Amino acid sequence: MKTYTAKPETVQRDWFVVDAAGQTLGRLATEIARRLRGKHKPEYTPHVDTGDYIVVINAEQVRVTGAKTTDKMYYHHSGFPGGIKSINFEKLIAKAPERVIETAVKGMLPKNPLGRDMYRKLKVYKGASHPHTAQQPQELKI
Amino acid sequence: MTIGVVGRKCGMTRIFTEEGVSIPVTVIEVEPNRVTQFKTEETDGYRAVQVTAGERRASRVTKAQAGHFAKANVAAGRGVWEFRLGEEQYAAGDQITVDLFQAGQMVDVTGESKGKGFAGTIKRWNFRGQDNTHGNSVSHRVPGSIGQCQTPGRVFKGKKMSGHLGAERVTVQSLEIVRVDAERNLLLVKGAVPGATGGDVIVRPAAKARG
Amino acid sequence: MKVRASVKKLCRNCKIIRRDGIVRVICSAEPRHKQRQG
Amino acid sequence: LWIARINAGARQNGLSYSRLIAGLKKAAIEIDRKVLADLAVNEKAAFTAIVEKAKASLA
Amino acid sequence: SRVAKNPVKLPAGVEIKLAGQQLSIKGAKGALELKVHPSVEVIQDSGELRFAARNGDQQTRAMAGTTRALVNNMVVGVSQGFERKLQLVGVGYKAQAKGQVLSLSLGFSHPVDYELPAGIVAETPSQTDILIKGIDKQLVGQVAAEIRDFRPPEPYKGKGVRYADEVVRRKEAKK
RNA sequence: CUGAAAGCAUCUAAGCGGGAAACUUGCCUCAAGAUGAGAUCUCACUGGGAACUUGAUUCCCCUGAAGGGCCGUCGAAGAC
RNA sequence: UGUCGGCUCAUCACAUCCUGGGGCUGAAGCCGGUCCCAAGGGUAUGGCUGUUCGCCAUUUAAAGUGGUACGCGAGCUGGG
RNA sequence: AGGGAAACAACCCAGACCGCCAGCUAAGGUCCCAAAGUUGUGGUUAAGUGGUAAACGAUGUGGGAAGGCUUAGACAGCUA
Ligand SMILES: [Mg+2]
Ligand SMILES: [Mg+2]
Ligand SMILES: [Mg+2]
Ligand SMILES: [Mg+2]
Ligand SMILES: [Mg+2]
Ligand SMILES: [Mg+2]
Ligand SMILES: [Mg+2]
Ligand SMILES: [Mg+2]
Ligand SMILES: [Mg+2]
Ligand SMILES: [Mg+2]
Ligand SMILES: [Mg+2]
Ligand SMILES: [Mg+2]
Ligand SMILES: [Mg+2]
Ligand SMILES: [Mg+2]
Ligand SMILES: [Mg+2]
Ligand SMILES: [Mg+2]
Ligand SMILES: [Mg+2]
Ligand SMILES: [Mg+2]
Ligand SMILES: [Mg+2]
Ligand SMILES: [Mg+2]
Ligand SMILES: [Mg+2]
Ligand SMILES: [Mg+2]
Ligand SMILES: [Mg+2]
Ligand SMILES: [Mg+2]
Ligand SMILES: [Mg+2]
Ligand SMILES: [Mg+2]
Ligand SMILES: [Mg+2]
Ligand SMILES: [Mg+2]
Ligand SMILES: [Mg+2]
Ligand SMILES: [Mg+2]
Ligand SMILES: [Mg+2]
Ligand SMILES: [Mg+2]
Ligand SMILES: [Mg+2]
Ligand SMILES: [Mg+2]
Ligand SMILES: [Mg+2]
Ligand SMILES: [Mg+2]
Ligand SMILES: [Mg+2]
Ligand SMILES: [Mg+2]
Ligand SMILES: [Mg+2]
Ligand SMILES: [Mg+2]
Ligand SMILES: [Mg+2]
Ligand SMILES: [Mg+2]
Ligand SMILES: [Mg+2]
Ligand SMILES: [Mg+2]
Ligand SMILES: [Mg+2]
Ligand SMILES: [Mg+2]
Ligand SMILES: [Mg+2]
Ligand SMILES: [Mg+2]
Numbered sequence: 001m002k003t004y005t006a007k008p009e010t011v012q013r014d015w016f017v018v019d020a021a022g023q024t025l026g027r028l029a030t031e032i033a034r035r036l037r038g039k040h041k042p043e044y045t046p047h048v049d050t051g052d053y054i055v056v057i058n059a060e061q062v063r064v065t066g067a068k069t070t071d072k073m074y075y076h077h078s079g080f081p082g083g084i085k086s087i088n089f090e091k092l093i094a095k096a097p098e099r100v101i102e103t104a105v106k107g108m109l110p111k112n113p114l115g116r117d118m119y120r121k122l123k124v125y126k127g128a129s130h131p132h133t134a135q136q137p138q139e140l141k142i
Numbered sequence: 143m144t145i146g147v148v149g150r151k152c153g154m155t156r157i158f159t160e161e162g163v164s165i166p167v168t169v170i171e172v173e174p175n176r177v178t179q180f181k182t183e184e185t186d187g188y189r190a191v192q193v194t195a196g197e198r199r200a201s202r203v204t205k206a207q208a209g210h211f212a213k214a215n216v217a218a219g220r221g222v223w224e225f226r227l228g229e230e231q232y233a234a235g236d237q238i239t240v241d242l243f244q245a246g247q248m249v250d251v252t253g254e255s256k257g258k259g260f261a262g263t264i265k266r267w268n269f270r271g272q273d274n275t276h277g278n279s280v281s282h283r284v285p286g287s288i289g290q291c292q293t294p295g296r297v298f299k300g301k302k303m304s305g306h307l308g309a310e311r312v313t314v315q316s317l318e319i320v321r322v323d324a325e326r327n328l329l330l331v332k333g334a335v336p337g338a339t340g341g342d343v344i345v346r347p348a349a350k351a352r353g
Numbered sequence: 354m355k356v357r358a359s360v361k362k363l364c365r366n367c368k369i370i371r372r373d374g375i376v377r378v379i380c381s382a383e384p385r386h387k388q389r390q391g
Numbered sequence: 392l393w394i395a396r397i398n399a400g401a402r403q404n405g406l407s408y409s410r411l412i413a414g415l416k417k418a419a420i421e422i423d424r425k426v427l428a429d430l431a432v433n434e435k436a437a438f439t440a441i442v443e444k445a446k447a448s449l450a
Numbered sequence: 451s452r453v454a455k456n457p458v459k460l461p462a463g464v465e466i467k468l469a470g471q472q473l474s475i476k477g478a479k480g481a482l483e484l485k486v487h488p489s490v491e492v493i494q495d496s497g498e499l500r501f502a503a504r505n506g507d508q509q510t511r512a513m514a515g516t517t518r519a520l521v522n523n524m525v526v527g528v529s530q531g532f533e534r535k536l537q538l539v540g541v542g543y544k545a546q547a548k549g550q551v552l553s554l555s556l557g558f559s560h561p562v563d564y565e566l567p568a569g570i571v572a573e574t575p576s577q578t579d580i581l582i583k584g585i586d587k588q589l590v591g592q593v594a595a596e597i598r599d600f601r602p603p604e605p606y607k608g609k610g611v612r613y614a615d616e617v618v619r620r621k622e623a624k625k
Numbered sequence: 626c627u628g629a630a631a632g633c634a635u636c637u638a639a640g641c642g643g644g645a646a647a648c649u650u651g652c653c654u655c656a657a658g659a660u661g662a663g664a665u666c667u668c669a670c671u672g673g674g675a676a677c678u679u680g681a682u683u684c685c686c687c688u689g690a691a692g693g694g695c696c697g698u699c700g701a702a703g704a705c
Numbered sequence: 706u707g708u709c710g711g712c713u714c715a716u717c718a719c720a721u722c723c724u725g726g727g728g729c730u731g732a733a734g735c736c737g738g739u740c741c742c743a744a745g746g747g748u749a750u751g752g753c754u755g756u757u758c759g760c761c762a763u764u765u766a767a768a769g770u771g772g773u774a775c776g777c778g779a780g781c782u783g784g785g
Numbered sequence: 786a787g788g789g790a791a792a793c794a795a796c797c798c799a800g801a802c803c804g805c806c807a808g809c810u811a812a813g814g815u816c817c818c819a820a821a822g823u824u825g826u827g828g829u830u831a832a833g834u835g836g837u838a839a840a841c842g843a844u845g846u847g848g849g850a851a852g853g854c855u856u857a858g859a860c861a862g863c864u865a
């Protein structure tokens with residue numbers, strides 16, 4: 001009698017669609033990270049990808065509380081001396097709405113080959129529609 | 143920008159004005175250009191036109207390229223180039239000559255510059271040499287220091303070192319058109335044009351304009 | 354304008370105002386009484 | 392690993408892990424976390440019966 | 451809040467329309483006033499306009515006086531248009547009003563052309579006096595402040611465009 | 626500028642503006658190994674059997690196109 | 706774990722020398738003084754001395770202050 | 786040695802005879818990385834304070850004990 005383990009070949013993956021249309025960035029993102037990892041399933045094992053597929057439709061309408069709309073800053077270094085570059089929440093929504101939700105969720109996942117595989121099941125769009133009507137996602141709240 | 147012609151660098155010369163001033167001139171032969179494909183919003187996204195010039199043998203054009211040149215009856219030529227146009231209208235099978243340019247009419251010229259093989263730091267980056275006497279040991283044209291001690295402790299990316307003064311592509315902006323010989327297909331441009339004689343150059347209206 | 358760590362009224366037309374989280378003194382009589390910070 | 396699986400299976404029945412252990416201990420049940428995790432995966436009908444016994448204990 | 455306890459007393463010729471938290475005033479010599487209210491402040495409708503809060507909050511109490519001021523401004527504007535008066539001092543400082551463009555000569559190397567937006571209209575009874583009429587205080591004041599910025603008053607001679615009801619600090623050269 | 630809290634005043638608490646070689650574009654170059662590996666035009670290939678561990682399987686015979694390379698004459702291209 | 710100065714090559718901070726935007730002035734103008742914002746680009750040649758520094762001569766829009774093993778000898782020198 | 790304090794001999798908990806895919810706790814903790822309350826009840830903060838620092842300065846905000854004027858008209862505004 002050994003403990004059950006999930007085989008990467010016979011896992012079940014469903015599709016969900018989430019509306020980010022008045023949801024806090026960090027509290028929407030924790031529910032996404034749970035579904036992406038599979039923590040909501042009794043068959044969860046730490047070393048296989050047993051999560052679900054998540055689709056986010058209204059990416060640009062996510063919001064932050066307080067003065068974080070202006071003072072929240074995103075940094076990245078280009079690799080050349082003095083190459084630190086920055087941008088804030090107002091500018092990033094105008095430039096790339098999807099990069100806001102993708103960046104939040106990506107930091108809530110493990111940083112290893114399996115973590116990058118959990119990240120490939122998240123689709124983020126900015127319109128009211130997605131191109132995944134064939135896969136027939138079902139609405140998910142929060 | 144947004145439209146232009148492809149030509150060949152024929153060499154530099156001069157012309158004298160009646161007032162007696164001599165103008166350095168680069169002569170550019172522009173064999174008439176043939177439109178190959180027109181790109182629109184519903185098919186490619188951006189708007190552009192595809193152009194061919196010159197002439198190529200029938201045994202050097204592949205079956206894939208021959209059928210592309212035959213959808214629009216154009217006859218194959220050397221190379222294929224594409225100009226990104228803002229708002230014009232072209233149909234596959236047109237002719238584009240030097241007749242979209244006038245005298246005056248600042249233009250930009252693009253070409254593949256002459257290639258220096260593997261240049262040192264003095265030639266490539268205008269470094270200055272160490273002493274040729276006064277005790278120097280086999281270190282006359284060498285670059286010198288490339289970093290600091292323990293802090294960093296690695297050369298920084300983008301350091302200026304030696305190798306390949308390239309045959310890259312460069313543009314020379316704000317060049318005046320002196321004469322437009324329509325019948326012999328010539329453009330006379332005041333100044334120097336990148337590349338050697340025979341190379342292909344692209345002529346487009348000046349982007350900056352103003353002065 | 355005079356920037357000090359301790360700003361306060363200098364006459365009887367100086368007014369204390371907090372503007373964008375900064376204490377300022379503005380004078381309707383003498384422009385020399387303008388202060389920032391503090 | 393067992394705790395992470397009883398937690399996921401108990402919330403399917405409407406109860407957290409910490410509330411399930413309190414209800415099980417309060418009423419009678421002394422089954423291990425190794426067997427509770429196994430029933431969560433394979434015998435989902437028995438697991439529901441156990442959880443309804445823990446919920447009925449007002450805790 | 452003393453101001454919020456004072457009604458507006460809308461005059462005889464006016465009109466009101468409250469679409470929920472949306473408000474508008476119709477009047478002679480100008481109409482079409484538009485404003486949307488924060489959800490914490492209430493405007494009752496009767497023969498008289500009165501305002502009251504919804505919460506006991508400090509910010510809500512502050513907004514119950516701002517909206518009373520704003521409603522008062524619109525009622526006057528659609529009945530008596532607001533205006534501001536500008537005065538020009540200095541030799542060679544003259545201005546001519548031409549329809550929707552005001553030409554100013556303020557000692558630069560070229561007369562400046564100021565564009566008057568819709569609503570407000572300017573006319574100069576003299577060449578050293580401007581008048582900006584309008585039906586809303588915010589637009590009349592902003593445009594008057596924009597004209598005044600071209601050559602703000604000098605402290606040694608008062609030269610430059612000024613307000614007709616402005617006190618200007620004058621001093622003298624120590625030399 | 627409009628404007629109350631605080632009958633006044635007040636650039637701010639709601640709302641609306643001007644504002645610098647700094648920031649983001651605009652100018653030049655590289656750029657889908659951007660493993661998220663994108664798009665467009667055109668071209669090429671239209672046979673049989675068997676063994677099974679019976680389908681993104683293996684083995685044999687026939688048939689190798691579009692095209693690429695080797696090779697040679699070189700080049701204002703180049704250390705190879 | 707090779708310690709000064711010179712040469713070649715640099716990189717960062719801002720407590721800004723110039724250029725840029727402003728408040729006050731015992732700011733008439735031309736030039737100034739002081740404080741605030743600003744790091745994009747610039748920022749001498751020689752005579753003396755081993756000199757860093759310094760004093761001189763003549764320029765410049767200005768000839769900034771500092772960290773980097775008081776940056777840099779498996780990059781050069783070797784005057785101290 | 787083990788668990789915690791991110792990593793961290795000397796701090797906190799606790800002293801490893803061996804094995805177990807059994808249970809209860811210590812310090813420390815329970816949104817995700819990452820095991821366990823997006824638990825319950827009443828308040829405070831608007832500073833990302835929390836998540837560094839003084840003399841000093843300021844109509845930020847909550848609570849408490851008292852005072853001086855005041856329908857014989859108080860405090861701001863305005864007319865002598
Ligand atoms: Mg060459
Ligand atoms: Mg030299
Ligand atoms: Mg020597
Ligand atoms: Mg030797
Ligand atoms: Mg030698
Ligand atoms: Mg060294
Ligand atoms: Mg390192
Ligand atoms: Mg370099
Ligand atoms: Mg100070
Ligand atoms: Mg401001
Ligand atoms: Mg007011
Ligand atoms: Mg005011
Ligand atoms: Mg505001
Ligand atoms: Mg602006
Ligand atoms: Mg410039
Ligand atoms: Mg590719
Ligand atoms: Mg491709
Ligand atoms: Mg071939
Ligand atoms: Mg072939
Ligand atoms: Mg080829
Ligand atoms: Mg060769
Ligand atoms: Mg040097
Ligand atoms: Mg450099
Ligand atoms: Mg740094
Ligand atoms: Mg500073
Ligand atoms: Mg300076
Ligand atoms: Mg300056
Ligand atoms: Mg200045
Ligand atoms: Mg000044
Ligand atoms: Mg700078
Ligand atoms: Mg700098
Ligand atoms: Mg600098
Ligand atoms: Mg710099
Ligand atoms: Mg910078
Ligand atoms: Mg710029
Ligand atoms: Mg010198
Ligand atoms: Mg010197
Ligand atoms: Mg000497
Ligand atoms: Mg240091
Ligand atoms: Mg030091
Ligand atoms: Mg140093
Ligand atoms: Mg040193
Ligand atoms: Mg140094
Ligand atoms: Mg040496
Ligand atoms: Mg040395
Ligand atoms: Mg050596
Ligand atoms: Mg070394
Ligand atoms: Mg050597």
Ligand SMILES: [Mg+2]
Pocket residue numbers: none
């Ligand atoms: Mg010696």
Ligand SMILES: [Mg+2]
Pocket residue numbers: none
């Ligand atoms: Mg010697």
Ligand SMILES: [Mg+2]
Pocket residue numbers: none
């Ligand atoms: Mg330890």
Ligand SMILES: [Mg+2]
Pocket residue numbers: none
């Ligand atoms: Mg620590």
Ligand SMILES: [Mg+2]
Pocket residue numbers: none
């Ligand atoms: Mg540890």
Ligand SMILES: [Mg+2]
Pocket residue numbers: 809
């Ligand atoms: Mg326990």
Ligand SMILES: [Mg+2]
Pocket residue numbers: none
């Ligand atoms: Mg405890």
Ligand SMILES: [Mg+2]
Pocket residue numbers: none
């Ligand atoms: Mg980890």
Ligand SMILES: [Mg+2]
Pocket residue numbers: none
């Ligand atoms: Mg957990």
Ligand SMILES: [Mg+2]
Pocket residue numbers: none
């Ligand atoms: Mg709660």
Ligand SMILES: [Mg+2]
Pocket residue numbers: 833836
């Ligand atoms: Mg913080």
Ligand SMILES: [Mg+2]
Pocket residue numbers: 836
């Ligand atoms: Mg902090």
Ligand SMILES: [Zn+2]
Pocket residue numbers: 363364365366367380381382383386
């Ligand atoms: Zn004063």
